[PDB]
Amino acid sequence: MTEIATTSGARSVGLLSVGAYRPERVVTNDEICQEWIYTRTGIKTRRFAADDESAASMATEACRRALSNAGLSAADIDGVIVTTNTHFLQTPPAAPMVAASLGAKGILGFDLSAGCAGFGYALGAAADMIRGGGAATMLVVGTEKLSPTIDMYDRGNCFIFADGAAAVVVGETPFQGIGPTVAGSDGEQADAIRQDIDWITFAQNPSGPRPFVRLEGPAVFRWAAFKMGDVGRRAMDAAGVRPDQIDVFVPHQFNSRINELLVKNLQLRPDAVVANDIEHTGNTSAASIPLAMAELLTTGAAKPGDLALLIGYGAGLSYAAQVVRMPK
């Protein structure tokens, strides 16, 4: 029964920085179709990536900005996790591609897919790896090129999804910066948000329709609005923080009315800042939460060290939540 070593890393880990990338093309409600969109969803405009851009290329840019904001270079990073739904290759994964693009072609890394909640899972996994001693400093980047997956004839969701990327640096902090991860799924509602035709079935029958994103609105709305408050409470309990201590709330930027209901259910202070990046960023799935954090810090709405509650929710029916201290 030979000894296998037990190891550990730094106990206190937090967000050292965030960097964000949004593509340049402003897309209006009048272009992604064929008066009440803003009212119903909270969206006015979104950003679409260029043809030559990819989830991977945007991840690279966000990571560059996150390193710069941390006072770090790529040689300081031990690992990278890319989280996404729009890396349109079965292999290779985007993480080593990003690693090489940053000039650290040899560092560990993998891709994490958990629908919209990928970021919360990816954060928790980096936190755990570092505390476990598998790394000291990591990049976690949510990146999405959703624009090509949208059926422009589907008024059900055509105005929802968008493009962009955002990265956080995660590493040793003087005090705990990332609370315990509260996560879960509802695999019985896997169909509620989906690619409608798998790629192989499509490739094997090219005379058929191509795949696009499909959404089941009432079922999604119902689930989020009514279960996400209890998830938020578990995240606050686990972190040992009270609802009234939360300065910033970053729900997934999926729909404004869902997020409005959550705020009331969660019993946060009246002055708690609630992320509304959705209005000019739309729904950027895995990139949503860190894009919203960056946006709040940019505008002055949040400050480094603010207590933020993050709740990711979406496809698979997956959610991941945690309390953090704001970076930068």
DSSP string, 137-179: EEEEEEEEE-GGG--TT-TTTTTTB-EEEEEEEEEE-SS--B-
Query: In the chain, how long is the greatest CA-to-CA distance?
Result: 70
| Interface residue with a copy of itself, options 68, 75, 152, 210 (CB under 8 A) | 210
* Residue nearest ligand D1T, Cβ-based: 314
Q: What is the CA radius of gyration of the chain?
A: 19
Buried b vs exposed e over 295-317: b needs ≥16 C-beta within 10 Å? bbbeeeebeeebbbbbbbbbbbb
319 Cβ contact partners less than 8 Å away, ≥ 6 residues apart: 117, 120, 183, 184, 185, 227, 228, 231, 311, 312, 313
Catalytic residue check, 280: no
- Where do contacts with ligand D1T occur on this chain (CB under 6 A)? 85-86, 90-91, 115-116, 149, 193, 195, 211-213, 285, 314-315
| Interatomic CA distance for residues 165 and 23, integer angstroms | 9
DSSP state of 243: G
Which residue from 24, 36, 52, 204 is in contact with a copy of itself, where contact means CB under 8 A? Answer: 204
CB of 60 to ligand D1T, least distance (A): 20
Catalytic, out of 69, 157, 158, 252 = 252
Residue 15 or 276: the one with the smaller Cβ distance to a copy of itself is 15
Got the DSSP string for 285-310?
Answer: GGGHHHHHHHHHHHHTSS-TT-EEEE
Asked if 29 is an active-site residue, the reply is: no
| Interface pattern 93-122 for a copy of itself (x via CB under 8 A) | x-xxxxxxx---xxxxxxxxxxx-xx--x-
Q: Rank residues 252 and 276 by Cβ distance to a copy of itself and give the closer one.
A: 252
Cβ 267 to ligand D1T, closest distance in Å? 26
Least distance in angstroms from the C-beta of 302 to ligand D1T = 24
Amino acid code (one letter) for 47: R
DSSP state of 239: T
Instruction: Choose among ligand D1T, a copy of itself, none what residue 290 binds, the Cβ cut-off being 5 to 8 Å by kind.
Output: none
111/295 with CB nearer a copy of itself: 111
Question: Is 252 a residue of the active site?
Answer: yes
Which 231-290 positions form the footprint of a copy of itself (CB under 8 A)? 238-241, 245
What is the smallest separation between the CB atom of 202 and ligand D1T, expressed in angstroms? 9
Catalytic sites, residue numbers: 116, 252, 283
